[PDB]
Each structure stands twice: as C-alpha cells, then as structure tokens.
Design a protein around this ligand. Structure first.
Ligand SMILES: *[C@@H]1O[C@H](CO)[C@@H](O[C@@H]2O[C@H](CO)[C@@H](O[C@@H]3O[C@H](CO)[C@@H](O)[C@H](O)[C@@H]3O)[C@H](O)[C@H]2NC(C)=O)[C@H](O)[C@H]1NC(C)=O
Ligand SMILES: *[C@@H]1O[C@H](CO)[C@@H](O[C@@H]2O[C@H](CO)[C@@H](O)[C@H](O)[C@H]2NC(C)=O)[C@H](O)[C@H]1NC(C)=O
Ligand SMILES: *[C@@H]1O[C@H](CO)[C@@H](O)[C@H](O)[C@H]1NC(C)=O
Ligand SMILES: *[C@@H]1O[C@H](CO)[C@@H](O)[C@H](O)[C@H]1NC(C)=O
Ligand SMILES: *[C@@H]1O[C@H](CO)[C@@H](O)[C@H](O)[C@H]1NC(C)=O
Ligand SMILES: *[C@@H]1O[C@H](CO)[C@@H](O)[C@H](O)[C@H]1NC(C)=O
Ligand SMILES: *[C@@H]1O[C@H](CO)[C@@H](O)[C@H](O)[C@H]1NC(C)=O
Lengths: 98, 69, 287, 49
C-alpha cells in the first residue's frame, strides 16, 4: 500500500518535495492552553485609566502602594471586596488603585 | 406542622470560657444527658436549678442561664 | 522491577484530629485585618482523619471526591510522589507526580501502571511505577516539594485545573499532627481537563501518611497585614464556632445569638390515590 | 525539523500549555503556501485554544 516518492534533484517543481505543516486549532469546553503573546501598553501613573491586567479589569488611578502581597496574590481587595491594589504582571510592583 | 424553631447559642465571652449550650425554640430535647426542657425551647449542653438567681444570659419565659461550678 | 510487595499491612485507620490544619489560601486576593468567610473544600477542623503507614510497603487507593489533604513523614529514605485518576487501571489518562531532590515532575498521560506502583531508587525511577506510557497531555516541571518537617499538601481539581498546595511544619509526634493553624500556598496550576475519582499514595521503595478527604465547608478566615491567614473558624462544627461565623468574628461577647433553624424531617412518605387500571386511551387517538 | 514524516504516516505534535505569535509565520515570507481557514490570517494572536 505504501509507495515511495521518487524525490529526485532533477524533478521539475511540481514533482519536488514540499514540507507541509498544518496547525489545527481545537476549541473545546475545556481550559484553553495554547495562547497568543497577549497585548500590553505603557504603564501610566497618576492619571484616570481604563485597565486590564491579565484579565483584571476596571477603571481608576494607580500609585505606588505601601503594602506587600504574597507570591500567590496578584491583587488585593478592600472591605467590600473591590479592588484595593493590583500587581503589574510585567514589572511586579503593587500599585494602589484610587 | 412538623416541629421546628430558631436555634440560638448561649455563650460566655470567648476570652472567659468555651462552654456553650443551644436553645431550640419550642421543640423537644429528643427532636433537636445535659438537656433542659422548658417552655422557651430545649437547651442542650445545660443543666437546671429551681431556685431563683440574678439574670445573665436569657432563655425566655422568666428563665436565664448563668455559669456556676 | 515492579515488584508487588503484597504486604497487606491492614493497619487500623488510626484516625487522629486534624485540629486546625487543612487550610490553604483559596484565592489571589490580598486581605488585611478582615475576617473573610469562604465556602470551599478543606479538612473540617477537629475531624478524625486516617494516618496509615506503609511502614513491607502498601499503596492503598482512597476516593478523591472534590480534593484530598495529604501529609507525610519519612526517615532517611524519603518518599516523594502521588497517583491520581478516574480508575487507575490503564484505560484512561491519569496524573503522576514524581518528586526528586532538585525538581518535580507533574505529568498527565496514560500510564501502563504496575500492580503495586513504586519509585525505584540517586533518584527515583518511573519505570517501577508504570512500565510504559502513551496518549500524553502535559508534563510540568518545577521546584521540589522538600524543605521533622511534615510536608503538608492539598490536591484539588477545579474547573479542569490540578491544584497543588504546600507547606512545611515541625513534628512533635511522628504519628500525629503538629498543632496550630495551616495556610498552604499553591505551587502548581495545571489546565488538563481530566477528572479524578481515585487517589493512590505513591511510594518509593527504601513511611507514615496522613490522608483526609476535603469537605465543602465554610471557614472564617482571619487575614493579617502580610495577606496571610493567621487563624480560622470551621463554621457549623460546633455551636461556638457557629456563633463566631454567624457574627463574622473570631471572638464572641457574652450573650445569646441566633445561628440556625431546626427542622424535624419526615420518617415516611405516603402516597394515596384512586385505583384505575385503564391505561388512558390517548394512545387510541394516535391509533 | 531535521526530518518530516511520510504523508501516509504524518506526524502529530500535540501542543498545549504554551504561547505563540503566529504573525511570525507570515512576516518571514518563508512559505510558498500559507492559507488560514475558520480563523483569519491577519495576526490572530488574541485567540487561545
Ligand atoms: C519581564 O521582562 C522584562 C524585560 O524587559 C523585565 O524588565 C527588565 O528588568 C530588569 C531588572 O530590573 C532591568 O535590568 C536593569 O534595570 C535597571 C533599572 O530598570 C537598570 O538600572 C539596569 O542597568 C538594568 O538594565 C531591565 O532594564 C528591564 N527591561 C526593561 C525595563 O525593558 C521585567 O523585570 C520582567 N518582569 C517580571 C515580572 O519578570
Ligand atoms: C528531577 O527531575 C527533573 C525533571 O525531570 C530533572 O531534570 C531533568 O534532568 C534530566 C537528566 O537528569 C535531563 O535529561 C532533563 O533535561 C531535565 N529536565 C528538565 C525539565 O530540566 C532533574 O535532573 C531531576 N533530579 C535529579 C537529581 O536527577
Ligand atoms: C413534645 O412535647 C410536647 C409537650 O408535652 C408534646 O405535646 C409532644 O408530643 C412532644 N413531641 C414529641 C415527644 O415528639
Ligand atoms: C431542682 O432541680 C434539681 C436538678 O435539676 C433536681 O434534682 C431537683 O429535684 C429539683 N427540685 C425540685 C423541687 O423540683
Ligand atoms: C487517547 O486520547 C484520545 C484523545 O486525547 C481519547 O479519545 C482516547 O480515549 C484516549 N485513549 C486512551 C486509551 O486513553
Ligand atoms: C506582617 O506585616 C507587619 C506590618 O508591617 C510586619 O511588621 C510583620 O513583620 C509582617 N510579618 C511577616 C512579614 O511575617
Ligand atoms: C397507538 O398509539 C400508541 C401511543 O401513541 C403507540 O405506542 C402504539 O404503537 C400505537 N399503536 C399502533 C400504531 O398500532
């Protein structure tokens, strides 16, 4: 059943070997694990900003905080669980949200 | 109606002792050894005395709990 | 070698108290000087949890349910590893953790497991756990789980993610738990999409293992200025803990508080109706 | 790759748990054929599978 190809150095183009790679992208009701590079913009302090830090969104003004977070804590929340501060994923620093 | 009622806990301050008892409003002590059946409900984890004393933590219907050795 | 040790130690479960151990950080939120109550899988406090020793070695299989707490101690020859899956009979993919001195391999694949899987041993050999594997999903490599220091772990499976949490605590008693409050941190989050129904402790051959099932219970978690949990109350464990959770406090003032609602449940269910033997001629409308 | 499989026995690499910029494949102008279906070819890096 299997026939070898005569891939000769003298073949015309239609008979020359070609390498083919097919990238199949499967989306299931399961965690997505093969992602693009994602986008970012410059970090801007002391101005009113529309934010998205790795999916954490909202609006406000950032300043440097005076508190430290655990390695598992990428953000903090206040008395009513609203954002208190966020950490910058490309420059980890804790920045208070006003 | 099948027996039911509010459930309340009688407690000392937590920096005094951890002895607590539970009062089950208007129900039997068998439905909820130290089980005090009264009109307010059944108090579980408590004993009772028939003499009168100053009120500390109320049960209801003229009865109050307190802590004694 | 894949030697079946067939020891059948059959130790009594030797259940001991979980005390206030079994808590891990449930989320990524920093909190300070607040008592955030949260419902999740944890060990109930003061629950009686089995402490089985292989020490003649055994690799028993227990229900995974919605997650399991595991902790252990060993002497000289240290045991590092776990097996999780839906069957563990080599028909489906499973999770194998082999943890050595310099790193850890957390892998999900279809493993052709040995009758009594062991890590051959200066490092562990996977061939003695399973003889072969195929249909692989993901091999994750990170830092080892090594530090008298009990290695405490939580294994969960949430929304397809395998979540592994850990901490190290000094042991006063070899066969029992250090007393005090735990707060384990996650190290590994793996987006696999595979269910676990069964958990097997994986042993290395040269051995005391504490294993408890987690239960979906609310804990009042007390957070300090570090974002850490320094204490907790297991809600509805006992009447005082009920009062503390109801009041969102780790302390209660002298008094009486309403915490619940008692209901008598029915003993029997009785159905009464007219006796008709005529299957209704709606079918006749169709015919 | 140093070597490719035969078409009767094409190879499959299962890719998971990673990040890739697919615009690289077009920016290079290194392929004679490059067509996308379902998903647009125009730098569709905002998707995850
Ligand atoms: C993510 O990767 C970026 C790569 O851009 C990391 O940024 C880099 O951070 C290092 C360490 O601070 C910088 O090197 C040193 O920076 C200081 C002051 O910024 C400078 O005085 C030294 O001469 C030296 O260059 C590097 O410049 C910086 N790259 C930038 C800003 O483009 C970043 O730290 C990484 N973030 C995480 C969370 O891993
Ligand atoms: C512990 O396990 C890790 C992960 O397998 C080992 O790292 C590998 O080491 C082998 C040879 O020892 C290499 O072929 C691999 O390339 C390594 N993998 C990675 C991801 O780095 C580590 O060496 C093991 N520890 C010991 C003491 O052998
Ligand atoms: C509870 O006590 C009441 C008051 O005597 C009585 O009427 C009722 O039968 C009791 N219920 C029980 C025993 O279930
Ligand atoms: C008072 O209560 C005590 C203890 O509950 C009991 O032993 C005693 O019989 C009671 N006395 C009377 C007069 O009911
Ligand atoms: C192999 O994996 C595929 C998809 O990942 C699945 O359909 C199949 O059931 C698996 N076979 C075994 C034996 O696990
Ligand atoms: C927690 O935060 C307080 C307040 O700064 C600090 O004094 C203490 O050292 C911290 N505890 C740690 C880092 O373990
Ligand atoms: C009559 O109708 C019933 C219900 O629609 C159906 O199950 C049955 O097959 C029918 N009998 C016939 C078509 O002979």
């Amino acid at each position: 059943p299997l026939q070898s190809y005569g891939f000769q150095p003298t073949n015309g183009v239609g008979y020359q070997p070609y390498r083919v790679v097919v990238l199949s992208f499967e989306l299931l009701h399961a965690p997505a694990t093969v992602c693009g590079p994602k986008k970012s913009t410059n970090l801007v302090k002391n101005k009113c900003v529309n934010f998205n830090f790795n999916g954490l969104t909202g609006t406000g003004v950032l300043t440097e905080s005076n508190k430290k977070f655990l390695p598992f804590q990428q953000f903090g929340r206040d008395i009513a669980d609203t954002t208190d501060a966020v950490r910058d994923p490309q420059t980890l620093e804790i920045l208070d949200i006003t | 109606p099948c027996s039911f009622g509010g459930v309340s806990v009688i407690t000392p301050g937590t920096n005094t002792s951890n002895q607590v008892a539970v009062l089950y409003q208007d129900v039997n002590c068998t439905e909820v050894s130290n089980v005090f059946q009264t009109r307010a409900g059944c108090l579980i984890g408590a004993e009772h005395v028939n003499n009168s004393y100053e009120c500390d933590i109320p049960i209801g219907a003229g009865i109050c709990a307190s802590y004694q050795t | 070698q894949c030697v079946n040790l067939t020891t059948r130690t059959q130790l009594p479960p030797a259940y001991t108290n979980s005390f206030t151990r079994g808590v891990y950080y449930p989320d990524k939120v920093f909190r300070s000087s607040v008592l955030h109550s949260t419902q999740d899988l944890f060990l109930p406090f003061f629950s009686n949890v089995t402490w089985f020793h292989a020490i003649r070695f055994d690799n028993p299989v227990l229900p995974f349910n919605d997650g399991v707490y595991f902790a252990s101690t060993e002497k000289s020859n240290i045991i590092r590893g776990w097996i999780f899956g839906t069957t563990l009979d080599s028909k489906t993919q499973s999770l194998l953790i082999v943890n050595n001195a310099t790193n850890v391999v957390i892998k999900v694949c279809e493993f052709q497991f040995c009758n009594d899987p062991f890590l051959g041993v200066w490092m562990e050999s996977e061939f003695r756990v399973y003889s072969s594997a195929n249909n692989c999903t993901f091999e994750y490599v990170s830092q080892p789980f090594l530090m008298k220091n009990l290695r405490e772990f939580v294994f969960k499976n949430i929304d397809g993610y395998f979540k592994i949490y850990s901490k190290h605590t000094p042991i006063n008693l070899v066969r029992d738990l250090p007393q005090g409050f735990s707060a384990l941190e996650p190290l590994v989050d793996l987006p696999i999409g595979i269910n676990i129904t069964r958990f097997q402790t994986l042993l290395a051959l040269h051995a005391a293992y504490y294993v408890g099932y987690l239960q979906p219970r609310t804990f009042l978690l007390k957070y300090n200025e570090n974002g850490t949990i320094t204490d907790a109350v297991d809600c509805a464990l006992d009447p005082l803990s009920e009062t503390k959770c109801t009041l969102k406090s780790f302390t209660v003032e002298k008094g009486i508080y309403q915490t619940s609602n008692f209901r008598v449940q029915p003993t029997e269910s009785i159905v009464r109706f007219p006796n008709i033997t005529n299957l209704c001629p709606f079918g006749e409308v169709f015919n | 790759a140093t070597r490719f499989a035969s078409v009767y026995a094409w190879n499959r690499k299962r890719i998971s748990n990673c990040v890739a910029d697919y615009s690289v494949l077009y920016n290079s102008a290194s392929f004679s054929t490059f067509k996308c279906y379902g998903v647009s070819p125009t730098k569709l890096n905002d998707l995850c599978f």
